[PDB]
Amino acid sequence: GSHMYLRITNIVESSFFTKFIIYLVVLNGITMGLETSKTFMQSFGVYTTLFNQIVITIFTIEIILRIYVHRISFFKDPWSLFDFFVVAISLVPTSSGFEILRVLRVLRLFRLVTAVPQMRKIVSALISVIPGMLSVIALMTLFFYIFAIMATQLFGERFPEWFGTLGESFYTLFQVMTLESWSMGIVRPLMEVYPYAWVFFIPFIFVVTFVMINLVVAIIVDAMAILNQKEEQHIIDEVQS
Amino acid sequence: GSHMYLRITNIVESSFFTKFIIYLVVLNGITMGLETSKTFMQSFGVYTTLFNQIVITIFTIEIILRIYVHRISFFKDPWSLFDFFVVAISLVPTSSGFEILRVLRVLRLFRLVTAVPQMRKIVSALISVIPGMLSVIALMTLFFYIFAIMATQLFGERFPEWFGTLGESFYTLFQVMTLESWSMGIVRPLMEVYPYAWVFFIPFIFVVTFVMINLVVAIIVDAMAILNQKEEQHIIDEVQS
Amino acid sequence: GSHMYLRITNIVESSFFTKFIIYLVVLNGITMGLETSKTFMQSFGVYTTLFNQIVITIFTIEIILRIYVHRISFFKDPWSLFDFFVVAISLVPTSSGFEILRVLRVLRLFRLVTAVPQMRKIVSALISVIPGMLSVIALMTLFFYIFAIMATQLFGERFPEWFGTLGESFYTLFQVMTLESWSMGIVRPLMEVYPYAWVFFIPFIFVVTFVMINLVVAIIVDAMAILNQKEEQHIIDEVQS
Amino acid sequence: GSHMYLRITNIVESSFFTKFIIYLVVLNGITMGLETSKTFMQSFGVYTTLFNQIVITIFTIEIILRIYVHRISFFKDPWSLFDFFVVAISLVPTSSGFEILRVLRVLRLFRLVTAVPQMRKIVSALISVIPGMLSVIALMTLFFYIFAIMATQLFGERFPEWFGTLGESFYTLFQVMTLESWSMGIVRPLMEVYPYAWVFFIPFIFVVTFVMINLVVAIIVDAMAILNQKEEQHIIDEVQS
Ligand SMILES: CCCCCCCCCCCCCC(=O)OC[C@H](COP(=O)(O)OCC[N+](C)(C)C)OC(=O)CCCCCCCCCCCCC
Ligand SMILES: CCCCCCCCCCCCCC(=O)OC[C@H](COP(=O)(O)OCC[N+](C)(C)C)OC(=O)CCCCCCCCCCCCC
Ligand SMILES: CCCCCCCCCCCCCC(=O)OC[C@H](COP(=O)(O)OCC[N+](C)(C)C)OC(=O)CCCCCCCCCCCCC
Ligand SMILES: CCCCCCCCCCCCCC(=O)OC[C@H](COP(=O)(O)OCC[N+](C)(C)C)OC(=O)CCCCCCCCCCCCC
Ligand SMILES: CCCCCCCCCCCCCC(=O)OC[C@H](COP(=O)(O)OCC[N+](C)(C)C)OC(=O)CCCCCCCCCCCCC
Ligand SMILES: CCCCCCCCCCCCCC(=O)OC[C@H](COP(=O)(O)OCC[N+](C)(C)C)OC(=O)CCCCCCCCCCCCC
Ligand SMILES: CCCCCCCCCCCCCC(=O)OC[C@H](COP(=O)(O)OCC[N+](C)(C)C)OC(=O)CCCCCCCCCCCCC
Ligand SMILES: CCCCCCCCCCCCCC(=O)OC[C@H](COP(=O)(O)OCC[N+](C)(C)C)OC(=O)CCCCCCCCCCCCC
Ligand SMILES: CCCCCCCCCCCCCC(=O)OC[C@H](COP(=O)(O)OCC[N+](C)(C)C)OC(=O)CCCCCCCCCCCCC
Ligand SMILES: CCCCCCCCCCCCCC(=O)OC[C@H](COP(=O)(O)OCC[N+](C)(C)C)OC(=O)CCCCCCCCCCCCC
Ligand SMILES: OC[C@H]1O[C@@H](O)[C@H](O)[C@@H](O)[C@@H]1O
């Protein structure tokens, strides 16, 4: 709380600071689309590469400033950690030879989420449902795991591409979950060799489908139940009192 | 409010006027189906072309009359603006050389929506949900935008048809959203060259799917919550009073 | 109400009568599966053909008896009319030369629905939702109709199989509604010739999808609202009284 | 209740016993994944085969102990019966020559469900919805059965792979239910020979789809109705009393 501390603290926390960052993101966003065209890149490429290095500099300063202001409270904020790791990624230099990190640089456009509070509320809303499903996700994954193992050893030898490997079978089973080509592309070919392959995949399709629908039904109905508790208690004690 | 004004105002606003338009639309509707058959067109084509020019004349008169009656209130009515722009389109002549406008002429059948009030209520109902989703739509589109950029530069060089271009990648990503052939048609081919391509598309499939379902769940549950507020207040103050 | 009338009326209305019919249906049901195997048919075919003619005789008698008992009240009962028309179909003889009616004979197994009251309740439940959707169905069909006409004339000339005809276009548009191969099978081929074909089908996919989901959401939420009216009135007037 | 009985009864019922089993399952689970790699199997295969025989021994002892403790109450517990039949399967020796039972051995990983009570609650939750649907399932299956018979005899002769047989037709009809390639893969080929085949499959697609959605809607709305009964009674009699 020194006098130097509050100097920067009043900047960082200013609406102009936030607004300025958003301007940059929206600008670097448009810039990253244009960088997609080799035509544009041949003409104006050096400009954009610099604007890019400019922006990432600013964002590094910015993240350093917020760390001064917020201190340990910054590394316990998920939105700040995200901003951190996105900016960290952008710093690993293009010479790294692993172009994956060059492409991951686009994740900085997600600042337009962490910085706009109406976006934060949505993402928070969406994510909020997930912790109640962790056990169902675990059940589903165990299920996938068991069936991946059985598939690999029923079909891996004749169908190595689809089932030669735990991973390949996981992949194929996820594909059948989405029902994408599950019969013409997978199970019908399978059955020219394993005529009962349908006894594996149909029940797999039933379970996995039943569970997902039931997840959604339970979420709606159990929420409506809580809304009803809060209304019961209110009505019932405006009557008692 | 002159005496000439109300002369036409009583026509325009008459049930017979409305009924007459609907008759025409339903007639021009049947006519536009028959115009689809070259057989029919070879026999009776000139008849229909004229009936068509007739109807569009009437509709132009009609729209002019409603503008006299309603004045500035007409250009603040979305149903009137629609009727306007559909009739405007039909006026651009067949010589224009841009047959798109010739085909857009079919949109005049949508008068059967703007003119029948039971239809207006449905469309109004449906559209009513949209303004609350604008922020989610924006989040989704930003998401698509970020992933379109990463895809274009991970896969555009070897897969120009599916990913050579921001637009092509947008297209393909929408296709994967609907899950149409996402694995046999897209990701499996992709992985003969980029074995980890599944680390891109599966999480993309999870997010986009999770969000859409969660949109629907939130709409049902948040509405049921409002219905519960209005019932709380009623019950609670018939008790207080 | 004569003494002969009630003689048969007590049979027709007896539990044994109903039970007997169900036995027959379940028996003719098993029989119609076995008739599917040419092996079985070569061995036991003449037996089954007769059992079949037997059963349809009985059912004709049965339907005649119920008409005596129920009189005009029988032709105002949808379950009876169904039983009627299914038995009518079975009477048109195999010599007719239109094997469609030979196959429609299988519809008599649906007696196992019209005769078992737990089934009747389900089907009644399901059908009950439909009259409230008639206007939405009409909107959807008008929509399909307008888009079928535009598609036929944008794409019918180069793509006669998918769009050469109002009917063909209806078909294809229903296929795109279910999203079956809409992109790899239809729109991607289309775009090698009409690069903007995506401006037609994507918005078509949005509308048709939006509407169906919104139909379901409205049904759940509007029902929950009615359940809330009936509970309001009860609570509110046990308080008033 | 002898003194020897309670000796083992206190073990079986101990938290350490349960915990120990779970450790084993999670260990044999990891082991069954590694057994998937021929590389690993060539190096460490004999180890795993023994660990496997070890674990199944333990589980046999374990199941015998729980039978002593629980007696007839064990064969009326579905979770115990499952554990039983999974362990029974594992006992049939590898010499049996029916490798299906060798693969079914993986089902022992489902102990991680029967033994962890948070999992039991989920599966119990999910299964709980099913008994109310039995009649709808029956209606659906009758429906499939009737349509399988009609399809087999309309299309079995020209399309033996898809419809030559009651079973083949069942399969294909389930495929059309999931909408997987129903048009490009099935109905479009069908219509080059049977131009009206769409009069069969489209209504089939409507019914089967309508029913499934309606099942889900009814489940949500009928539950919300019960939640409303329990809240009515509470509110209404805190007012009466
Ligand atoms: C109602 C909820 C439903 C949730 C269902 C979840 C069930 C599990 C989903 C798994 C998805 C499919 C994963 C997959 O593709 O597996 C690949 C990997 C290893 O494969 P690998 O052999 O490297 O590569 C296969 C492709 N190839 C041969 C061309 C290189 O295989 C693995 O290594 C297995 C990875 C397991 C991932 C578990 C994901 C947890 C879900 C997170 C929750 C998100 C909520 C929004
Ligand atoms: C009862 C359950 C208890 C919990 C158990 C959870 C942990 C299980 C881990 C099992 C790990 C098994 C890994 C494995 O077998 O890898 C197989 C393959 C590699 O095959 P390999 O033949 O070694 O490749 C040789 C390559 N070459 C020729 C070039 C030399 O590589 C792959 O296929 C990739 C491996 C994907 C593993 C996916 C793991 C899913 C975890 C699910 C957890 C569920 C918890 C409830
Ligand atoms: C839960 C809500 C979910 C909403 C998700 C929305 C996410 C975004 C959907 C985008 C849909 C796909 C658009 C698409 O095809 O992109 C094409 C264009 C430019 O492509 P272009 O390169 O011209 O042509 C590609 C095809 N080709 C090469 C054969 C000519 O690409 C563009 O120019 C991008 C256009 C962006 C459109 C944004 C649409 C907003 C949705 C409206 C809300 C409707 C509610 C009923
Ligand atoms: C952090 C985000 C901030 C917000 C940013 C939103 C605005 C972004 C606009 C980016 C515009 C980039 C346009 C672009 O790169 O076009 C690429 C291609 C043309 O490639 P090009 O190589 O120029 O074609 C040469 C043709 N030749 C050979 C015959 C001479 O043409 C195409 O591929 C069509 C371009 C489709 C653009 C789709 C725009 C989606 C907007 C999403 C907005 C999300 C807001 C939350
Ligand atoms: C995990 C949840 C993520 C959710 C957000 C999505 C993030 C995006 C992940 C993107 C992964 C894309 C992987 C892929 O296959 O892309 C292609 C690259 C490069 O191909 P490469 O393997 O170099 O083969 C080149 C062959 N050649 C020379 C003949 C052309 O392949 C590679 O270089 C493989 C490298 C694997 C990277 C793994 C990245 C982990 C996720 C990123 C960090 C989280 C951000 C929130
Ligand atoms: C949320 C509700 C969604 C409802 C959406 C309904 C929208 C309309 C659905 C239409 C379905 C597709 C009909 C179709 O395939 O059209 C074929 C016919 C004439 O085709 P045609 O040229 O004879 O044959 C085409 C095939 N070919 C060339 C190989 C012989 O084309 C016609 O003749 C048109 C027939 C219009 C049928 C209208 C159906 C009303 C729906 C009934 C409600 C059921 C509720 C359970
Ligand atoms: C503003 C809307 C007002 C309401 C209008 C509703 C009534 C519309 C009826 C239109 C009837 C048009 C029939 C038509 O054009 O048929 C075209 C084709 C036959 O083509 P054609 O070239 O004659 O075949 C010649 C055969 N050859 C070479 C062997 C001699 O045959 C076909 O393609 C089959 C025709 C399918 C008709 C589907 C009708 C859907 C009704 C939707 C109603 C919506 C109400 C809200
Ligand atoms: C809203 C609820 C929706 C429920 C819808 C249920 C409707 C019926 C589903 C039937 C699923 C398809 C069964 C199927 O593939 O049929 C095959 C068998 C005999 O086929 P088969 O000729 O041996 O083999 C065909 C394949 N081939 C030629 C290559 C060897 O065909 C048969 O033998 C018939 C088997 C009937 C099974 C009935 C299943 C009851 C559902 C259980 C409820 C689960 C709830 C989680
Ligand atoms: C009104 C309804 C009353 C209830 C009726 C329920 C019971 C129906 C049972 C019917 C059994 C018919 C079995 C049948 O026809 O099998 C046909 C084929 C075998 O064909 P086949 O030509 O004998 O094979 C000869 C093989 N060869 C050349 C090597 C010598 O093999 C197959 O295709 C497999 C058979 C699949 C049977 C699926 C049964 C579904 C039950 C649905 C029950 C619904 C209850 C509400
Ligand atoms: C409308 C809602 C219905 C809902 C319940 C479903 C009822 C089932 C309808 C079945 C329609 C099947 C039509 C179809 O394409 O089947 C094939 C037949 C016969 O083929 P065909 O056209 O004779 O060509 C033979 C060519 N050859 C000599 C070289 C082999 O094709 C024909 O013979 C065409 C005949 C069209 C029959 C139209 C039937 C109307 C519906 C049945 C009455 C309602 C029952 C509730
Ligand atoms: O206590 C919080 C502090 O953590 C340290 O790691 C940093 O160097 C400081 O700048 C930060 O304020």
Asked if residue B48 lies in contact with residue B35, where contact means CB atoms within 8 angstroms, the answer is yes
Report how far apart the first and last C-alpha atoms of chain C are (Å, whole number).
49
Range B24-31, long-range pairs (CB < 8 A, 24+ positions) = B24/B55, B24/B58, B24/B59, B25/B108, B25/B109, B25/B111, B25/B112, B25/B115, B26/B112, B27/B51, B27/B55, B28/B52, B28/B55, B28/B108, B28/B109, B29/B109, B29/B112, B29/C145
Rg (CA), chain C: 26
C183 and B181 Cβ atoms separated by less than 8 Å: yes
Q: In this structure, what token pair is assigned to residue B90?
A: 């039909």
CB C108 within 8 A of CB C63: no
Q: How many CA atoms lie within 13 A of A87 on its CB side?
A: 21
- What class has domain B132-240? mainly alpha
Q: Of the candidates C83, C75, C90, which has an alpha carbon nearest to the alpha carbon of residue C114?
A: C83
Region class of B14: left (phi > 0), else alpha (psi between -120 and 50), else beta: beta
Find out whether D84 and D63 touch, Cβ atoms under 8 Å.
Answer: yes
Distance CA C137, CA D215 (A): 20
The reply to whether domains C3-124 and C132-240 share a CATH topology is no
Q: Whose CA is nearest to atom 44 of ligand 8?
A: A206
- What is the CATH code for C3-124? 1.20.120.350
**Which residue puts its alpha carbon closest to atom 37 of ligand 3?**
B141
Q: Which of C180, C218, C21 is nearest to C114 (CA)?
A: C21
CB-CB contact of D26 with D120 (8 Å): no
C179 and B180 within 8 Å at the Cβ level: the answer is yes
- Tell which atom from ligand 2 comes closest to the C-alpha of D35: 15
**Calpha distance B150→B171 (Å, rounded):** 14
Distances from the Cα of A81 to the Cα of A70, A72, A78, A111, A155, angstroms: 12, 11, 5, 12, 44
Tokens 């109002």 locate to: C166
What gap in Å lies between CA B74 and CA A93, rounded to an integer? 60
Give the number of C-alpha atoms closer than 13 A to the C-alpha of residue B90, restricted to the C-beta side. Answer: 24
- Residue with the nearest Cα to atom 46 of ligand 10? C107
CA C120 to chain CA centroid, nearest Å: 14
Token representation of residue C169: 């276009």
B123: chain C residues, CB-CB within 8 Å: 139
- Comparing CA positions, the residue from B111, B116, B58, B112 lying closest to residue B85 is B111
Break chain C into its structural domains and give their ranges. 3-124, 132-240
B160: which chain C residues are within 8 Å (Cβ-Cβ)? none
Q: Ligand 6: residues within 6 Å at CB?
A: C 130, 136-137, 140-141, 144, 165, 167-168, 170-171, 174, 212, 215; D 191, 195, 198, 202, 206, 210
Q: Which residues of D touch B224 (CB under 8 A)?
A: 224
Q: Specify whether the CB–CB gap between B45 and B105 falls below 8 A.
A: no
Measured in Å, residue A227 CA sits from the centre of ligand 11 at: 44
Angle ∠(D29,D32,D38) on CA atoms, nearest 5: 155
In chain C, % helix, strand, coil (3-state, to 5) comes to 85, 0, 15
Q: Which residue, among C190, C214, C241, would best test binding to B if mutated, counting the most B CBs under 10 Å from its CB? A: C214
Surface of B (96-125) touching A: CB under 8 A:
none
**Residue D109 in contact with ligand 2 by CB distance below 6 A:** yes
Nearest CA in chain C to A236: C235
- In a 13 Å sphere around the CA of C162, the CA atoms on its Cβ side amount to 19
Q: Based on the number of CB atoms within 10 Å of its own CB, is A42 exposed (0-12), middle (13-18) or buried (19 or more)?
A: exposed
- Ligand 10 centre to CA of D185 (Å) is 20
CA distance to A160, A175, A210, A218, D101, per residue, from A205 (Å): 22, 11, 8, 20, 22
Q: For chain C, what is the total number of helices (H) and then of strands (E)?
A: 12, 0
What CATH number should be reported for the domain whose range is A3-117?
1.20.120.350
Alpha carbon distance A219, A126 (integer Å) = 13
Give the tokens for residue D64.
């015998």
> Which residue's CA is the closest to the ligand 2 atom numbered 23?
D37
Distance CA C85, CA C78 (A): 10
Q: What is the DSSP string of chain B?
A: --HHHHHHHHHHTSHHHHHHHHHHHHHHHHHHHHTT-HHHHHHHHHHHHHHHHHHHHHHHHHHHHHHHHHGGGTTT-HHHHHHHHHHHHHHS-GGGS-HHHHHHGGGGGGHHHHSSHHHHHHHHHHHHTGGGTHHHHHHHHHHHHHHHHHHHHHHTTT-HHHHSSHHHHHHHHHHHHHTTTIIIIIIHHHHTT-TTTHHHHHHHHHHHHHHHHHHHHHHHHHHHHHHHHHHHHHHHHHHH-
Q: Whose CA is nearest to atom 4 of ligand 3?
A: B137
A136's tokens: 């169902």
- Tell me the C-alpha distance between B145 and B25, whole Å: 41
D161, D189 Cβ separation under 8 angstroms: no
Q: Is D235 on the interface with A (CB under 8 A)?
A: yes
Whether the Cβ atoms of residue A27 and residue A56 lie closer than 8 Å to each other: no
**Cβ atoms B204, B173 nearer than 8 A:** yes
- Give D184's DSSP letter: I
CB atoms B205 and A118 under 8 Å: no
Q: In a 3-state reduction of DSSP, which class is residue C205?
A: helix
Task: Determine the Cα–Cα distance for residues A198 and A221; give it in Å rounded to an integer.
Answer: 34
Return the residues preceding each gap in chain D, C–N over 2.5 A, or none. none
* B101 C-beta neighbours (distance < 10 Å), count: 15
B132 vs B115: CA distance, rounded Å: 27
Longest dimension (CA), chain D: 80
Instruction: Return the residues preceding each gap in chain A, C–N over 2.5 A, or none.
Output: none
Optimal mutation site among A103, A104, A120, interface B, most CBs of chain B within 10 A: A103
Q: Which residues of D fall within a CB distance of 8 Å from B239?
A: 239
Q: Which protein residues touch ligand 10 with a CB less than 6 Å away?
A: C 100; D 154, 194, 196-197, 199-200, 203
Closest alpha carbon within chain D to A229: D231
Cα angle at A65 between A62 and A71, to 5 degrees? Answer: 130
> Is B128 known as a binding-site position?
no
Q: Which two tokens stand for residue A91?
A: 């710093």
Pair D87, D106: CB distance under 8 Å: no
Q: Find all residues with CB under 8 Å of C228, minimum gap 6, and list them.
A: B227, B228, B231, D228
Whether C224 and chain A come into contact, CB under 8 Å, resolves to: yes
With H, G, I as helix, E, B as strand and everything else as coil, classify residue D28.
helix
Q: Check: CB of residue A168 under 8 Å from CB of residue A162.
A: yes
Burial class (CB in 10 A: 0-12, 13-18, 19+), C79: middle
Structural tokens at position C143: 């929509």
Q: Do D228 and C223 touch (CB under 8 A)?
A: no
The burial of C94, by beta-carbon neighbours within 10 Å (0-12 exposed, 13-18 middle, 19 or more buried), is given as: exposed
Is residue D111 within 8 Å of residue A137, measured between CB atoms?
Answer: no
Choose from A116, A122, A209, A215 for mutation: most chain B CBs within 10 A: A122
Q: Within a 10 A sphere around the Cβ of D118, how many other Cβ atoms?
A: 11
Instruction: Give residue C111 CA to ligand 8 midpoint distance, Å.
Output: 22
Any C CB within 8 A of D181 CB: yes
CA of A79 to nearest chain B CA: how many angstroms apart? Answer: 16
Q: Smallest CA–CA separation between C157 and chain D, in Å?
A: 19
How far apart CA A64 and CA A84 sit, in angstroms, is 9
Separation of alpha carbons C136 and B114, rounded Å: 14
Q: How far is B129 from chain A (nearest CA, A)?
A: 16
How far, in Å, CA of D16 to CA of C97, rounded? 76
**Partners of residue B235 in chain D, C-beta under 8 Å:** 235
Beta carbon of A42 within 6 Å of any ligand 4 atom: no
d(Cα A178, Cα B183) in Å, to the nearest integer?
10
Q: Of the bound ligands, which one is closest to the alpha carbon of residue D207?
A: 6
Query: For ligand 7, is residue C141 a contact (CB within 6 Å)?
Result: yes
Q: Collapsing DSSP states into helix, strand and coil, what is residue D231?
A: helix
Give the H/E segment covering residue C227: helix C198-240
Alpha carbon distance A228, A44 (integer Å)? 61
Contact assessment for residue A122 and residue B135, using Cβ atoms and an 8 Å cutoff: yes
**Residues with Cβ < 8 Å from D17, sequence gap 6 or more?**
D11, D62
Measured between CB atoms, does A207 come within 8 Å of chain D? no
Positive/negative CA dihedral, C62, C65, C69, C73: positive
C227 and D224: CB-CB below 8 Å? yes
Structure tokens at A72: 């340990």
What token pair was written down for B149? 């950029």
Question: CB C78: neighbour CB atoms within 10 A?
Answer: 11
C-alpha angle with apex D67: D64 to D68, nearest 5 degrees?
A: 90
Half-sphere exposure of C67 (CA within 13 A, CB side): 10
> Where is the binding site, in residues of C?
33, 37, 165-167, 178, 181, 231
For tokens 């998401």, name the residue: B143
Alpha helices in A92-197 (DSSP H): 99-104, 111-114, 117-128, 134-155, 160-163, 166-178, 188-191
Q: Are B154 and B193 in contact (CB under 8 A)?
A: no
Query: Is residue D40 in contact with ligand 8, taking CB distance under 6 Å?
Result: no
CB A208 within 8 A of CB D207: no
* Residue D182 CB partners (closer than 8 Å, separation 6+): C178, C180, D175, D176, D201, D205
Note whether B146 and A106 are within 8 A (CB).
yes
Burial B130-149 (b: 16+ CB within 10 A, else e): eeeeeebebbbebbbbbbbb
* In the block, residue with structure tokens 């009240």: C73
Cα–Cα distance, B167 to B158 (Å, whole number)? 16
What is the rounded CA–CA span in Å between residue A127 and residue A190?
Answer: 39
Query: In this structure, which CATH number among 1.10.340.30, 1.20.120.350, 2.30.30.40, 1.20.1530.20 belongs to the domain D3-123?
Result: 1.20.120.350
- In whole angstroms, give the CA distance from residue D59 to residue D57: 5
Check: CB of residue A110 under 8 Å from CB of residue A86. yes
**B–D interface: beta-carbon pairs under 8 A:** 4
**If DSSP codes are grouped into helix, strand and coil, which group holds residue D98?**
coil
Q: CA of C232: which chain A residue's CA is closest?
A: A235
Q: Which amino acid is at C19?
A: K
Q: What is the DSSP string of C100-165?
A: HHHHHGGGGGGHHHHSSHHHHHHHHHHHHTGGGTHHHHHHHHHHHHHHHHHHHHHHTTT-HHHHSS
CA D195 to ligand 3 centroid distance, Å:
35
May I ask the CATH architecture of the domain B3-119? Up-down Bundle (1.20)
Q: Is the CB of A30 under 6 A from ligand 4?
A: yes
Q: Which of C21, C26, C32, C39 to mutate to test the pocket of ligand 9 (most atoms within 8 A of CB)?
A: C39
Is C35 exposed, middle or buried, given 0-12, 13-18 or 19+ CB atoms closer than 10 A?
buried
* Residue C85 contacts residue C92 (beta carbons within 8 Å): no
CA of D178 to the centre of ligand 5 (A): 32
Nearest CA in chain B to D239: B239
Cβ–ligand 11 distance for A5 under 6 Å, the answer no
Q: Which of B188, D161, D159 is nearest to A192 (CA)?
A: D161
A165: left (phi over 0), alpha (psi -120 to 50) or beta: beta
What's the one-letter identity of residue C47? Y
Using only C-alpha atoms, chain B has a radius of gyration, in whole angstroms, of 26
Give me the helix-helix angle, B117-128 and C198-240, nearest 10°: 90
- Give the residue carrying structure tokens 């209504």: D203
Got the DSSP string for A55-85?
A: HHHHHHHHHHHHHHHHGGGTTT-HHHHHHHH
Query: Inter-chain contact C198–B107, Cβ cutoff 8 Å?
Result: no
- Distance of alpha carbon A12 from alpha carbon A67, whole angstroms: 10
